Design a protein around this motif. Structure first.
Motif, PDB file in Angstrom:
ATOM      1  N   UNK A  91       0.824  -1.197   0.000  1.00  8.37           N
ATOM      2  CA  UNK A  91       0.000   0.000   0.000  1.00  8.37           C
ATOM      3  C   UNK A  91       0.864   1.255   0.000  1.00  8.37           C
ATOM      4  N   UNK A  92       1.859   1.298   0.881  1.00  6.50           N
ATOM      5  CA  UNK A  92       2.749   2.455   0.945  1.00  6.50           C
ATOM      6  C   UNK A  92       3.492   2.609  -0.380  1.00  6.50           C
ATOM      7  N   UNK A  93       3.833   1.482  -0.993  1.00  7.38           N
ATOM      8  CA  UNK A  93       4.476   1.492  -2.298  1.00  7.38           C
ATOM      9  C   UNK A  93       3.589   2.106  -3.388  1.00  7.38           C
ATOM     10  N   UNK A  94       2.303   1.751  -3.415  1.00  7.58           N
ATOM     11  CA  UNK A  94       1.418   2.297  -4.448  1.00  7.58           C
ATOM     12  C   UNK A  94       1.371   3.821  -4.344  1.00  7.58           C
ATOM     13  N   UNK A  95       1.431   4.336  -3.118  1.00  2.56           N
ATOM     14  CA  UNK A  95       1.390   5.778  -2.904  1.00  2.56           C
ATOM     15  C   UNK A  95       2.708   6.395  -3.348  1.00  2.56           C
ATOM     16  N   UNK A 106      -3.085   6.663  -9.288  1.00  7.45           N
ATOM     17  CA  UNK A 106      -3.658   5.667  -8.395  1.00  7.45           C
ATOM     18  C   UNK A 106      -5.117   6.002  -8.112  1.00  7.45           C
ATOM     19  N   UNK A 107      -5.991   5.011  -8.247  1.00  8.97           N
ATOM     20  CA  UNK A 107      -7.380   5.177  -7.830  1.00  8.97           C
ATOM     21  C   UNK A 107      -7.843   3.938  -7.072  1.00  8.97           C
ATOM     22  N   UNK A 108      -8.642   4.142  -6.030  1.00 13.14           N
ATOM     23  CA  UNK A 108      -9.296   3.037  -5.339  1.00 13.14           C
ATOM     24  C   UNK A 108     -10.603   2.706  -6.057  1.00 13.14           C
ATOM     25  N   UNK A 114     -12.393  -3.973   4.708  1.00  8.68           N
ATOM     26  CA  UNK A 114     -12.210  -2.532   4.667  1.00  8.68           C
ATOM     27  C   UNK A 114     -10.873  -2.068   4.121  1.00  8.68           C
ATOM     28  N   UNK A 115     -10.149  -2.960   3.458  1.00  4.27           N
ATOM     29  CA  UNK A 115      -8.903  -2.551   2.828  1.00  4.27           C
ATOM     30  C   UNK A 115      -9.179  -1.941   1.457  1.00  4.27           C
ATOM     31  N   UNK A 116      -8.282  -1.071   1.006  1.00  2.50           N
ATOM     32  CA  UNK A 116      -8.510  -0.299  -0.212  1.00  2.50           C
ATOM     33  C   UNK A 116      -8.004  -1.046  -1.439  1.00  2.50           C
ATOM     34  N   UNK A 117      -8.893  -1.293  -2.397  1.00  3.14           N
ATOM     35  CA  UNK A 117      -8.496  -1.990  -3.615  1.00  3.14           C
ATOM     36  C   UNK A 117      -7.956  -0.977  -4.618  1.00  3.14           C
ATOM     37  N   UNK A 120      -4.075  -0.937 -17.021  1.00  4.89           N
ATOM     38  CA  UNK A 120      -4.767  -0.880 -15.740  1.00  4.89           C
ATOM     39  C   UNK A 120      -4.219  -2.026 -14.907  1.00  4.89           C
ATOM     40  N   UNK A 121      -3.360  -1.712 -13.943  1.00  9.02           N
ATOM     41  CA  UNK A 121      -2.735  -2.742 -13.124  1.00  9.02           C
ATOM     42  C   UNK A 121      -3.389  -2.786 -11.748  1.00  9.02           C
ATOM     43  N   UNK A 122      -3.925  -3.948 -11.383  1.00  8.56           N
ATOM     44  CA  UNK A 122      -4.530  -4.125 -10.066  1.00  8.56           C
ATOM     45  C   UNK A 122      -3.615  -5.034  -9.258  1.00  8.56           C
ATOM     46  N   UNK A 123      -2.769  -4.446  -8.400  1.00  9.54           N
ATOM     47  CA  UNK A 123      -1.668  -5.196  -7.791  1.00  9.54           C
ATOM     48  C   UNK A 123      -2.073  -6.306  -6.826  1.00  9.54           C
TER      49      UNK A 123
END
Ligand SMILES: CC(C)[C@H](NS(=O)(=O)c1ccc(-c2ccccc2)cc1)P(=O)(O)C[C@H](C(=O)O)c1cccc(CN)c1
Ligand SMILES: [Zn+2]
Length: 304
Positions: A14-18, A30-32, A39-42, A101-104
């Motif tokens: 998560x910190x990496x995506x930011x 980046x978009x959720x 409750x985690x952010x996809x 569109x990459x969904x990690x």
């Protein structure tokens, strides 16, 4: 801290995506696209040189919690994109002409569970009415011959198909996003392990896709390309006969939405380590897989 040659926990990814987005805003946004059951952010990373109405390729990792090399690949791909843009001619053309569109990580809740409690966990972590058993198999939860074969109706089983197609928040979020962007998405790639295969439709039945010949030729060329780097041998074919029938898969669903290039990748290895692939194989696995993904992208781009 984050490393591309180690498996990273969710907090770190998560910190990496930011961080990777903030450091490369001209190549990444980046978009959720939803929240998980817990409750985690996809997150979804749009990788590409920004521009009006670009076609796109959709790739996800981390459907299945224990398949850690899958999650590792999506991160590896993103760095390759950002570092080589402007220098490697193919990737430069790719990012100029289209978006990835990459969904990690799709199944974040399950992934966290493999870090905290059970390394061999597979499903999501949603609750099920009338039982203490937890979770649904996300790759049986799509509206593609849903729950008709190769899937369990029992919540305690590892291939539980859910209460209905898209019953899981995570699969609903992915399907909703692809439906909202159907006209731009030209290929769908979903990354799993292990087995060293490239699979294409169909898996929910023995019927073959209309462009079966083209998909077979494309898969064949991609596995050849993959092998040129380190000698790693993949097999390929329709899912139902190449691995086993399994209804409710995202790749079959994507195809039936009209996305003509739809593939499931099964990365290293062949079972010596299985899901517990050593971190020392992350680099080689990802580099060879890159070649196959880029081969497919080059093909798809030429066929717009
Ligand atoms: C190891 C890979 C092949 C995963 N399969 S698995 O269910 O976890 C599995 C893992 C290990 C074994 C096993 C290993 C050794 C001996 C006997 C059995 C059997 C099955 P998968 O990524 O989870 C396969 C995937 C799915 O089950 O959702 C799948 C299967 C069929 C078609 C497609 C394409 N939609 C995708
Ligand atoms: Zn899998």
């Amino acid at each position: 801290g984050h490393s591309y040659e180690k498996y990273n926990n969710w907090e770190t990814i998560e910190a990496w995506t930011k961080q990777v987005t903030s450091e490369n805003p001209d190549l990444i946004s980046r978009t959720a696209i939803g929240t998980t059951f817990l409750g985690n952010n996809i997150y979804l990373l749009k990788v590409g040189k920004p521009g009006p109405n670009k076609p796109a390729i959709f790739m996800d990792c981390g459907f299945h919690a224990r398949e850690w090399i899958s999650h590792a690949f999506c991160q590896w791909f993103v760095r390759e994109a950002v570092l080589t843009y402007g220098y490697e001619s193919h990737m430069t053309e790719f990012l100029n002409k289209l978006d990835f569109y990459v969904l990690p990580v799709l199944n974040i809740d399950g992934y966290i569970y493999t870090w905290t409690k059970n390394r061999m966990w597979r499903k999501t972590r949603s609750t099920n009415a009338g039982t203490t058993c937890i979770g649904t198999d996300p790759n049986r939860n799509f509206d593609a011959g849903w729950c008709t074969t190769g899937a369990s109706t029992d919540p305690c089983d590892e291939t539980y198909c859910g209460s209905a197609a898209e019953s899981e928040k995570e699969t609903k979020a992915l399907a909703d996003f692809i439906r909202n962007n159907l006209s731009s998405i030209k290929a769908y790639l979903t990354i799993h392990s292990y087995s060293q295969m490239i699979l294409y439709p169909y898996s929910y039945d023995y019927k073959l896709p209309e462009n079966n010949a083209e998909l077979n030729n494309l898969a064949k060329a991609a596995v050849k390309e993959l092998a040129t780097l380190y000698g790693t041998k993949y097999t390929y074919g329709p899912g139902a006969t190449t691995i086993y029938p399994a209804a409710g898969g995202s790749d079959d669903w994507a195809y039936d939405q009209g996305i003509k290039y739809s593939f499931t990748f099964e990365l290293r290895d062949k079972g010596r380590y299985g899901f517990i692939l050593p971190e020392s194989q992350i680099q080689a696995t990802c580099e060879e897989t890159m070649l196959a993904i880029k081969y497919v992208t080059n093909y798809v781009l030429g066929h717009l």
